[PDB]
Design a protein around this ligand. Structure first.
Ligand SMILES: O=S(=O)(O)OC[C@H]1O[C@@](COS(=O)(=O)O)(O[C@H]2O[C@H](COS(=O)(=O)O)[C@@H](OS(=O)(=O)O)[C@H](OS(=O)(=O)O)[C@H]2OS(=O)(=O)O)[C@@H](OS(=O)(=O)O)[C@@H]1OS(=O)(=O)O
Ligand SMILES: O=S(=O)(O)OC[C@H]1O[C@@](COS(=O)(=O)O)(O[C@H]2O[C@H](COS(=O)(=O)O)[C@@H](OS(=O)(=O)O)[C@H](OS(=O)(=O)O)[C@H]2OS(=O)(=O)O)[C@@H](OS(=O)(=O)O)[C@@H]1OS(=O)(=O)O
Ligand code: NAG
Ligand code: NAG
Ligand code: NAG
Ligand code: NAG
Lengths: 100, 124, 100, 124
């Protein structure tokens, strides 16, 4: 129960179309936040090519959504236009590697 | 301003900062609600479900937000997923599952129309 | 002077070709290691396309080499073969975002 | 086993775990070397160079490794980059730059042939 820990946080926002003028609809959401425990690093790599790239291998545990259910909803825009928006409710956070 | 801070350690440090009395159950004061939770404390240890504690806090100290004046609690699916795991064990301790936790009352899902929190445990 | 902090670490290894049989040459190197302070997160994003992707925006400060000088050296391999290897000595570590 | 742990707090917690007496300078015991460093302590505060302290530790408690029996210190370039910044100020305090820190002695660069540590400050 460490508040630092990577974890799910709850809050409400109101989705409204960026460009079109529309009525906002208030919905609840979740986000991932904390400090993954596992230290990070990168260390150098060796190439016998005349071409390198390959500069280093690194590891780093970010904190990200383990499990997320898609949602969506429709919006009524001034004049005819009625619109649909889609996003991801986040059921679970975990710490995973930044590059896979 | 409008909402108020959680004062129960047990329920501290989950998703959300803040709640508002009076309780969904109808508890008037966090202290009193504190009292009830304690009762469940042995159950929690048994670890029927991982999501148990969160759920109970959800009911007893519902989330709150300045954005709107209503309270936020758990969706059914979550409870059920919970209810099944612990309905029995509570039967041990010779205990009925309480009506206060009646899983009909909670909305089915989380939507514009209704806002409730879900967990990886789920149901209709 | 926090040992946790992202920072440069020194050590020696001996580079030897993986596949060819060769004489090893001992060299000194540096690597990056610690705990970047800045918490990490990701939070959901909204698309008005019928196509989403776009799942979340996240941030995460890994610990990586700020400043690194290329080096190289030659190796003598059994029979004729003499070979050259190239890598990066690391002069400075910093904490940067995982995806830029 | 072969090497031994740094015992000076001041030099603790830089790149490397371990050193081996006797000193490049010829210090016999970390304690004694500890004594010398202290003298530089005011200079460090002045912050002539950021890399100063590291450098001095490099000289006074050189890195060590089990991989080979030799000691590891700083490359010249680093020192110079350092030496220039602080040569003067040391002139304040009416102080010559010491021969022990003579920047000729340190190898030019870091290589198979010679191993020394470098910093972002650099020179030939
Ligand atoms: O959207 S509501 O929560 O307000 O629910 C129904 C009311 O919305 C309409 C149209 O207005 S609008 O949705 O505000 O643009 O119904 C439409 O809304 C519901 C709710 O879902 S949604 O995410 O808001 O779009 C849709 O239901 S569903 O998509 O979840 O299945 C309606 O479709 S349906 O009723 O399920 O078939 C959707 O279209 S429709 O307008 O219903 O054809 C109004 O229509 S109503 O449901 O026939 O009454 C409702 O009235 S209100 O003035 O928007 O409150
Ligand atoms: O490599 S050494 O540190 O041992 O230095 C010179 C000795 O290596 C040779 C060939 O053997 S080998 O290098 O072990 O394969 O010289 C070669 O090595 C030096 C050192 O650099 S390197 O990273 O090891 O390749 C090279 O210098 S340089 O590339 O840094 O500029 C030599 O090139 S050069 O002398 O600078 O022109 C490189 O090629 S060469 O053999 O010199 O033609 C032996 O050659 S020597 O330098 O003429 O004596 C040296 O003898 S040893 O038996 O390897 O110790
Ligand atoms: C809970 O209450 C609902 C409606 O109030 C009722 O239908 C049901 O019998 C009660 N018990 C349950 C859901 O187990
Ligand atoms: C340091 O010693 C070197 C060689 O031992 C000598 O050439 C020089 O005069 C001395 N002073 C320096 C480099 O400032
Ligand atoms: C309370 O903390 C939550 C998360 O810990 C955060 O979202 C909120 O902004 C905090 N309160 C204020 C006034 O920032
Ligand atoms: C000493 O610590 C350094 C880095 O802090 C590490 O490389 C080394 O492995 C440590 N000693 C041992 C025996 O692991």
């Amino acid at each position: 129960s460490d508040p630092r820990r990577c974890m799910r946080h709850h809050y409400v926002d109101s989705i409204s179309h960026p460009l079109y003028k529309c009525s906002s609809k208030m919905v609840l959401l979740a986000r991932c936040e904390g400090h993954c425990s596992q230290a990070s690093r990168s260390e150098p790599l060796v190439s016998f090519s005349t071409v390198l790239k390959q500069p280093f291998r690194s590891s780093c545990h970010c904190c990200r959504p383990q499990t997320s259910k898609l949602k969506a909803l429709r919006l009524r825009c001034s004049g005819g236009m009625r619109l649909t928006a889609t996003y991801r409710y986040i059921l679970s956070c975990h710490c995973e590697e930044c590059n896979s | 301003r409008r909402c108020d801070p959680i004062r129960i350690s047990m329920c501290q440090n989950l998703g959300y900062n803040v709640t508002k009395m009076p309780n969904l159950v109808g508890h008037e004061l966090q202290t009193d609600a504190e009292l009830q939770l304690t009762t469940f404390t042995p159950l929690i240890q048994y670890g029927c479900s991982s999501q148990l504690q969160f759920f109970l806090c959800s009911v007893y100290v519902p989330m709150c937000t300045e954005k709107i004046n209503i309270p936020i609690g758990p969706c059914g699916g979550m409870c059920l997923s919970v209810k099944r795991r612990c309905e029995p064990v509570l039967k041990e301790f010779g205990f009925a599952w309480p009506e206060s936790l009646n899983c009909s009352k909670f909305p089915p899902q989380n939507d514009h129309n209704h806002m409730c929190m879900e967990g990886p445990g789920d149901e209709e």
